[PDB]
Write a protein that binds this ligand. Sequence first.
Ligand code: TSS
Ligand code: CA
Length: 223
Amino acid sequence: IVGGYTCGANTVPYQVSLNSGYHFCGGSLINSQWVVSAAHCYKSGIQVRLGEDNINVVEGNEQFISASKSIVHPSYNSNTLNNDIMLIKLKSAASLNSRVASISLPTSCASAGTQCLISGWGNTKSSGTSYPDVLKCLKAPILSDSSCKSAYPGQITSNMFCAGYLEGGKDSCQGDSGGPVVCSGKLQGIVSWGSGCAQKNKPGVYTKVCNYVSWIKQTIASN
Ligand SMILES: NCCc1c[nH]c2ccccc12
Ligand SMILES: [Ca+2]
């Protein structure tokens, strides 16, 4: 997260870190045994880390649970990043509490102008490289479809939306991938892609979660 703020320990209780020897992506806990992330975060040997603030220090509220299975969306295209969504099932159910909690799926899509919270452990620099240990947060509005398409000609599908600031300076970044965009207590977005981070006229692009609620529910019900 570039140009954000320190969230505060366990204030984003649905935020997870995906670990394969190291943090490599964010995710969102949507029930006691399932996490939503980005399809471009797919790899084998994933351990889901819940209740994290400092990802380099065991602080006492963590739950580490290995993934039993990952399900990349059937229509995910890694070239265009269309349908950039993946489900991860935990080998055992997380113990839910005030610091490890699920986030609700949307019942409706959020409109341009809606204020949201974007979070993660990604790079905090737009040019350099610096990775924080504690969770970073950014409040950002959803941008109009037209401004999003104008920013990225030929690249925005109906399964994507832009959020952030056309002036630059505030954005998600590398390592935030797969993490949450939450608006009014609903998971509306997944950190997907962009051209660099926090660059003028290049806002972050996010997977449009409301398009996937049926697939998510249906998949969980049979897996
Ligand atoms: N807005 C951040 C989009 C993003 C995801 N992964 C990245 C890697 C490098 C640069 C940007 C990104
Ligand atoms: Ca920790």
